[model samples]
Target: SNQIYSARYSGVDVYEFIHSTGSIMKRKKDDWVNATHILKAANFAKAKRTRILEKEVLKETHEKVQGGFGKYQGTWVPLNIAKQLAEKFSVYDQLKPLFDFTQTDGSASPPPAPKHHHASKVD
Candidate 1:
């Protein structure tokens, strides 16, 4: 239960593999019933955090209408902002009108990284 855990955690960090050798050294064969799996998959998902996920807001957007005001003149309430905020609450339960923040058109994310999965060769 350290600050970090196996990048793939089941709601809790799993760092057993790091200290497995030390803990297992003294345990007798009789502890089998109490011992959980010492090995696991530590594959980290670089985290495809939705636009709001980066700010941790992507994790709790339900039971509330929490978001920002759009800078555009004609656009009334930001539907996109409402959607992004609602995505966070998805884990607790589904929504009647599911809020998904998949539109990554600059306004939703930080400056693009140097690498693009694909390139605009013509431009």
Candidate 2:
């Protein structure tokens, strides 16, 4: 009827319960039941919760960036900020498509000079 024990995992919390019939159970969802053992429930809950968290981070990054990453041009200030946040959250790889890692500031390098050629006729 009430939670007797609980375990915390990455992005998930699993609760243990005891029924009047003297059986142990653990659950992470309301409708789902895992009466087999606490270890099994905790493992599955961790995997499922991690996946959900990963998707949530990806969605948050997309919303924060707004338009496509290419629109940032050479500045890429906001784009870089979003990238930092993604990396801090450990979801940068999943959100990698939303960034242009190859972009660089134009001022960082100077353009090469054009070549000039002159021809003289032999007398």
Candidate 3:
């Protein structure tokens, strides 16, 4: 069964689930994308918080890197792409905090191993 968890951010509802292959899938409305993409996009968006003019510059850079024209031109980055990515990150960040079951606690230590005992055989 596929279980989905929902969370809210800035009045927007977000959905997420773990894929059978272990990839974390996130959805906003009907669109779904891997967590990797959302995180990377969000990080890039966060770094641009200092200057408003840099947003357009980044969009142009993205367009050029994507080779420009066709559907990939402006679609690669949006005028409000930063805002959208930041929202996505916020949604996921809050979701984890809201649900305790998903927490791993710490990564450095593994779960304790089980101990086994040998039984004596009857004569």
Candidate 4:
């Protein structure tokens, strides 16, 4: 394949825009990392739009997926990530669109009201 060398960036600019700011990065698929990473990277590769051109959170998520958390830890990322997303996407479901869910419930849930401790009750 070494003989297929050409310096033509003919149609590269079009896909460059899509891969950079597309929502595929945010979407979670069945694959470990966002599958769109390969998609975008591939698309970019197709158009030769690759290099240290742009920063990608996908790589950070990549690091997170590939050994940042131990085996059982990152599996729950979707749920907690969903909650964080829900908080972020919340928009005052009560009345108008100007409100954010997190803004209302932003206060940390009280911690179990503190457990009762009895010194003499148990021996």
TM-score, one value per model:
0.15, 0.19, 0.22, 0.16
lDDT of candidates 1 onward, in order: 0.21, 0.29, 0.33, 0.23
TM-score of 3: 0.22
List candidate 2 stretches off by more than 4 Å: 1-77, 100-123
* Candidates in order: C-alpha RMSD to true structure: 22.7, 24.9, 17.9, 20.9
lDDT-based ranking: 3, 2, 4, 1
Off by over 4 Å in 1: 1-77, 90-92, 96-123
lDDT of 2 by residue, 1-123 (tens): 322344322243333233221222222332112211212222232564345323433343322111432211111112334345435533344324223222335657332222345589799
**Which ranges of candidate 4 are over 4 A from the true structure?**
1-31, 35-42, 46-54, 64-123
Error of 4 at 79 (Å): 9.8
Cα misplacement distance, residue 98 of candidate 3 (Å) = 21
| Model 2 superposed RMSD (Cα) | 24.9
**What would the TM-score be for candidate 4 when compared with the true structure?**
0.16
Which digits, one per residue and each the tens of the lDDT, describe model 3 over residues 92-121?
Answer: 443342223344457664322223465999
Q: What is the lDDT of residue 60 in candidate 2?
A: 32
Candidate 3 structure lDDT: 0.33
Off by over 4 Å in 3: 20-25, 35-123
Full-model lDDT, candidate 4: 0.23
Q: Order the candidate numbers by TM-score, best to worst.
A: 3, 2, 4, 1
